[PDB]
Amino acid sequence: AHAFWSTQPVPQTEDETEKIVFAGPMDEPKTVADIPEEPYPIASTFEWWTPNMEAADDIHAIYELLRDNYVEDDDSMFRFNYSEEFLQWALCPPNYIPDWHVAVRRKADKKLLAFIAGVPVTLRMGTPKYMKVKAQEKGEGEEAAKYDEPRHICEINFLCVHKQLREKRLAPILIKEATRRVNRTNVWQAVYTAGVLLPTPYASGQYFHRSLNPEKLVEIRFSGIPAQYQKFQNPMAMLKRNYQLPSAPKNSGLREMKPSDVPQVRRILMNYLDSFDVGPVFSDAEISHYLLPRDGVVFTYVVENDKKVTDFFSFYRIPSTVIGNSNYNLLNAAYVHYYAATSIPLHQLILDLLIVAHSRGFDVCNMVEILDNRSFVEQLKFGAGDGHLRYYFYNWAYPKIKPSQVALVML
Ligand SMILES: CCCCCCCCCCCCCC(=O)SCCNC(=O)CCNC(=O)[C@H](O)C(C)(C)COP(=O)(O)OP(=O)(O)OC[C@H]1O[C@@H](n2cnc3c(N)ncnc32)[C@H](O)[C@@H]1OP(=O)(O)O
Ligand SMILES: CN(C)Cc1[nH]nc2ccc(-c3ccc(F)cc3OCCc3cccnc3)cc12
Numbered sequence: 001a002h003a004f005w006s007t008q009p010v011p012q013t014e015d016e017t018e019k020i021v022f023a024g025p026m027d028e029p030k031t032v033a034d035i036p037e038e039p040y041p042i043a044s045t046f047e048w049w050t051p052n053m054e055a056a057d058d059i060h061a062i063y064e065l066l067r068d069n070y071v072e073d074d075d076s077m078f079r080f081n082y083s084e085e086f087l088q089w090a091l092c093p094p095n096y097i098p099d100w101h102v103a104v105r106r107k108a109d110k111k112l113l114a115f116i117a118g119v120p121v122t123l124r125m126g127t128p129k130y131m132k133v134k135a136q137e138k139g140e141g142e143e144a145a146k147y148d149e150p151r152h153i154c155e156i157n158f159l160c161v162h163k164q165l166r167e168k169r170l171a172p173i174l175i176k177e178a179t180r181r182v183n184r185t186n187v188w189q190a191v192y193t194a195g196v197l198l199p200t201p202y203a204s205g206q207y208f209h210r211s212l213n214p215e216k217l218v219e220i221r222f223s224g225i226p227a228q229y230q231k232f233q234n235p236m237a238m239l240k241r242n243y244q245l246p247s248a249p250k251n252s253g254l255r256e257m258k259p260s261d262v263p264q265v266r267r268i269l270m271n272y273l274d275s276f277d278v279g280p281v282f283s284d285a286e287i288s289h290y291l292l293p294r295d296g297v298v299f300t301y302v303v304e305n306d307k308k309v310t311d312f313f314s315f316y317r318i319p320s321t322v323i324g325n326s327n328y329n330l331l332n333a334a335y336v337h338y339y340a341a342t343s344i345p346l347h348q349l350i351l352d353l354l355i356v357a358h359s360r361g362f363d364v365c366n367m368v369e370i371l372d373n374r375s376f377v378e379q380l381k382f383g384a385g386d387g388h389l390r391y392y393f394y395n396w397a398y399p400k401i402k403p404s405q406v407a408l409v410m411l
């Protein structure tokens with residue numbers, strides 16, 4: 001059924017998945033020297049291209065491909081519209097590897113036809129807690145602990161084939177070439193997410209939305225006036241009342257994050273993320289890059305009490321194109337990023353997130369039920385959306401875990 005995925009080192013079924021008791025590689029080991037030094041063969045009318053993220057034109061080309069051809073919702077009403085500044089941020093973290101950004105252009109005119117990107121990540125991806133317990137009972141503790149150490153792997157994102165080239169088996173060619181370029185750097189695992197079901201997720205979580213501007217969400221048919229709001233003489237005014245937020249954060253002590261906060265934010269984030277089975281390890285440089293405020297891209301606030309940062313939250317912006325509304329062109333969405341609470345309940349920290357996002361003109365706040373995102377769903381009036389984000393590894397056997405055991409946010 002899967003002419004490409006059947007050839008690859010991933011669990012092939014939920015059954016195979018269910019028989020996995022220890023983290024580790026799928027494939028028997030290979031070496032750098034074994035990997036072909038030349039790009040994968042491609043049709044004589046296409047050419048491989050490694051964009052230069054320092055070049056505005058290169059970023060623009062990527063931007064335009066994704067604006068017109070990237071992920072839509074299931075009803076083709078909305079398409080993600082990542083900005084050029086967001087793409088530069090996402091694609092160029094500390095020590096990124098230029099060769100891991102892989103594109104296909106049409107030779108004649110240099111039109112970008114397909115793209116895939118890899119970036120480095122350091123991930124805790126050893127045997128999960130519930131499985132380590134089972135192992136201790138089997139006297140199988142050592143094998144269970146073998147791959148406990150954080151690993152330097154590849155995070156894959158932004159796979160896109162132009163609409164005119166769909167269903168021509170171009171996506172496998174992209175994936176094979178990305179795999180080659182990564183393997184040539186002695187990295188043999190990747191992590192990726194998708195909304196679609198592929199062989200075979202190690203975790204799956206529902207996504208959620210929190211209305212910040214319900215009048216606009218209704219206008220663009222992101223939301224409806226729910227049928228229960230019909231019992232009301234005036235459905236809409238009631239809907240705004242329901243989702244109203246304060247003008248200003250309620251935590252005194254909240255301010256935007258500045259560079260001098262990086263060491264403290266790194267400490268509190270790394271301590272928190274340890275509670276989770278799969279999660280990134282970030283250096284000070286990586287904390288700086290992923291969390292310092294950047295206009296229109298990422299927004300981060302700390303709670304500082306007695307000159308000590310005790311809590312923080314971050315969110316990032318992805319606008320969506322609204323396909324065909326006479327009044328609005330764009331949906332301005334905020335997505336919950338990393339956070340850590342030590343002084344206050346999480347619901348109280350994230351209420352400030354919603355307050356800031358609303359003040360700054362966002363229409364909706366979105367998140368997947370990873371981290372401890374379930375703890376504030378009800379009180380903060382998040383609703384479950386129509387699908388799931390699925391988490392996957394390439395070349396890593398991994399037992400099924402709950403999404404509330406996942407601490408990697410994928411952009
Ligand atoms: C160690 C290093 C490893 C590095 C690599 C790690 C793996 C990275 C994996 C990539 C992680 C990406 C993470 C993200 O960025 S997820 C976002 C994916 N992007 C979009 O949804 C944008 C809109 N759609 C498109 O651009 C195209 O429809 C894509 C490119 C998605 C498929 O193009 P097209 O529709 O023209 O089809 P095809 O004829 O070329 O190819 C058909 C084959 O492609 C398999 N397919 C379909 N969708 C996906 C998908 N999202 N992940 C992986 N595989 C996918 C499909 O099952 C089939 O294989 P098989 O079923 O026949 O076997
Ligand atoms: C995470 N990277 C690889 C991007 C990506 N690729 N496939 C994706 C499917 C879902 C989401 C997603 C994630 C978090 C969230 F809070 C809401 C989400 O989707 C709402 C529905 C939607 C989909 C598409 C367009 N508009 C709305 C991201 C996806």
Ligand SMILES: [Mg+2]
Pocket residue numbers: 161165166167168169170171
């Ligand atoms: Mg294709």
